[PDB]
């Protein structure tokens, strides 16, 4: 019975889980990194803006002011080690400062399910998907850093590692909680069939050419948020007007509107990504055929003229791309099992509320491992009470036991057929439009296939080198993922984000201003328990309003939203006749908790020249409210 001990244990070897292993080696920690694949602006006011609009207001605030206060030195670190602002290779340069540092990095060593007494995480129980070796990993904290669940659906663009194993086995100690399962961003530009992301100054084409999306979208077209454009391209498919193929209805990218050389200087990336998987150069304007444009109807002229098909268009639809939901964390990131941290996709921080900004992308796992890998480190400095040898021991053999049990049980049923069948329920019944008499259907599917896979049994009957030995024990945790992310979904009935419910087609601040945790505190439970954080309006920065694109009108207001806002108004014009900056207005309107580092002020380039022509108030960037009071 193997056990390693350490100070500091990181499960994940991506971005945010590096990132944070060089916080904990900075703090002298022995540090392990358990990974699953081997080693080879705008100012801030508005990005929090851009961050709390994008996240339809389900976001925690305080949150999303320590990301956007973190983000520029996120940047400016990333350069000091070498990624060349064009990438702003990032895991290179990442991976390459964790080994100056001397990270343990290990690779093949699968977690099976986290250590864990009184309450307290001592580490993990782990597989070696070589040897199928069983081993324990003792630790005074843990972070998880493993992704998203986006393998449970049947179309995604995660690669195959991002399965949410993590999160269940965080679900499965009864302990720790995932908040949102149901927030799922579907972004609008996946590859057909690849699921390649192909995200830029280019237009969405439907099968005649049209350039649609501005009869959707006035204000914001192809630039609304990745859940709205989703939504508009699908409705566009559904009258009809999608391009045919052999893996359904899809529309175009047209890249090569922007000239060659635009997209081969600029865009190298989606060029050479196009031609190696689709056999299409995006840069080639040129014509290749008229048929396409047949057929259009004569009398919806908001789509405007049928445009002739060009050889550079690129086949695209929306697919499942990021996992909003997660572990549950508190700010600093600790999970409600004290000592498990969790950074990233995988956890619900919760900066993304239902929506993850697509400008958000480059930078959210550096700047979480940064700041949570420093909570992580400091708490992994404290001196706690030891978890007994014996105790450790049974969590070894009870993982042993599991894995002879999937080899050697009476059970008939394949665990192929049972993971197959679940991302098709995914698929079809809880993607982008979601009905309540549908996601009743899917829940039960759901349950009978949760039922049927306790009979799963591995027909190849090794410990070791065992493919579909962690397709078993992979697919059972997804499917309680499953039930998690489709209850959620059921019981909320409005459309916030990525969630958008037919039958409750308005955002709900009064009622559904909440954050859906679900937790599974007993073994005999065959249904998550379900419960709500609601969200403070009153120590929102700014109240929930109209996001800027998608559907109008459409949120019933919080019953405190007057209250607040009036209090948020005189707050801003007493403090600014005072002459308070920006940093002092934000911290009256809403104290965060940032470390010292990191809350630093950001300065820029144009700092002077913001000053000088008198721009640089709190009010210059986020001014909705003091409209309103000025046009009065």
């Known amino acids: 019975m193997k056990i390693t001990y350490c100070d500091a244990l990181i499960i994940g070897g991506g971005l945010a889980g590096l ?58 670190e990333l350069a000091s080690w070498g990624v060349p602002w064009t990438r702003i290779t990032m895991l290179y340069a990442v991976a390459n400062e964790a080994l100056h540092h001397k990270v343990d990095i290990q690779d093949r060593k699968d977690m099976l399910a986290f250590i864990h007494h009184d309450n307290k995480c001592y580490g993990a129980v782990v597989r070696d998907l070589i040897t199928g070796e069983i081993s324990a990993y003792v630790s005074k904290g843990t972070l998880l850093a493993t992704g998203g669940y986006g393998r449970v659906y049947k179309h995604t663009t995660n690669a195959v590692i991002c399965d949410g194993a993590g999160a269940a086995s965080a679900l499965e100690t009864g302990v720790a909680k995932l908040g949102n399962m149901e927030a799922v961003q579907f972004h609008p530009t996946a590859l057909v069939p690849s699921g390649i992301l192909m995200t830029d100054g280019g237009v969405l084409r439907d099968k005649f050419g049209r350039r649609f999306m501005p009869a959707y979208e006035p204000e914001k077209k192809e630039l609304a948020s990745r859940d709205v454009v989703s939504r508009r391209i699908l409705e566009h498919i559904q009258k009809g007007y999608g391009a045919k193929s052999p893996y359904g209805d899809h529309v175009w990218l047209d890249i090569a509107i922007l000239g060659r050389n635009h997209v081969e200087k600029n865009l190298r990336d989606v060029r050479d990504i196009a031609m190696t998987f689709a056999g299409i150069d995006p840069a080639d304007s040129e014509e290749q055929t008229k048929d396409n444009m047949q057929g259009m109807p004569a009398n919806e002229p908001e789509y405007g003229q049928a445009m002739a098909k060009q050889k550079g268009w690129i086949p695209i639809k929306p697919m499942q791309h990021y996992s909003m939901g997660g572990v549950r964390t508190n700010p600093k990131g600790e999970t409600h099992l004290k000592g498990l941290f969790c950074a990233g996709e995988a956890a619900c921080w ?70 197959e069948r679940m991302k098709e329920v995914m698929d079809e019944k809880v993607g982008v439009f979601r009905e309540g008499k549908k996601l009743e259907e899917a829940l039960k599917e759901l349950q009978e296939l949760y039922a049927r896979s306790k009979n799963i049994c591995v027909k190849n009957k090794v410990l070791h080198n065992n493919p579909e030995l962690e397709d078993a024990y992979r697919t059972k945790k997804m499917l309680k993922l499953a039930l998690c992310i489709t209850q959620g979904a059921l019981l909320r009935t409005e459309s916030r984000g990525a969630h958008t419910r037919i039958d409750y087609p308005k955002r709900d601040d009064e009622k559904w201003l909440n954050r859906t945790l679900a937790s599974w505190p007993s073994t005999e439970q065959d249904m998550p328990t379900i419960e709500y954080e609601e969200l403070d309006v009153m120590k929102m920065e700014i109240s929930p309003d109209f996001r800027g694109y998608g559907k109008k009108g459409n949120f019933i207001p919080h019953p405190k939203k007057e209250e607040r806002d009036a209090e948020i108004l005189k707050t801003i014009l007493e403090l ?57």
């Not at 049974?394 to 008939?412: C, P, R, T, V, W």
Request: charged share 30%; with cysteine; aromatic share 8%.
């Open 19 to 76: 990132r944070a292993s060089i916080a904990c080696k900075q703090k002298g920690l022995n540090t392990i990194v358990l990974s699953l694949v081997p080693v080879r602006g705008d100012n801030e006011d508005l990005h929090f803006l851009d961050t709390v609009k994008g996240s339809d207001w389900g976001c925690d605030q305080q949150v999303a002011r320590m990301f956007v206060t973190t983000a520029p030195k996120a940047i400016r």
């Open 350 to 419: 919760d900066l993304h509320g239902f929506n993850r900004l697509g400008g958000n992308s480059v930078s959210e796992a550096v700047v979480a491992g940064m700041i949570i890998g420093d909570y992580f480190a400091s708490h992994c400095l404290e001196a706690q009470i030891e978890i007994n040898t014996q105790k450790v021991e049974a969590f070894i053999k009870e993982s042993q036991d599991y894995m002879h049990f999937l080899l050697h049980n009476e059970g008939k049923e394949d665990v192929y057929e049972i993971r």
């Open 576 to 632: 600014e006749k005072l002459g308070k900056d920006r940093i002092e207005v934000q911290h009256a309107l809403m104290p965060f908790e940032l470390q010292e580092k990191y809350k630093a002020r950001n300065m820029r380039l144009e700092d002077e020249e913001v000053r000088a022509r008198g721009e640089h108030l709190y009010s210059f960037n986020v001014h909705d409210l003091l409209d309103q009071h000025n046009a009065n």
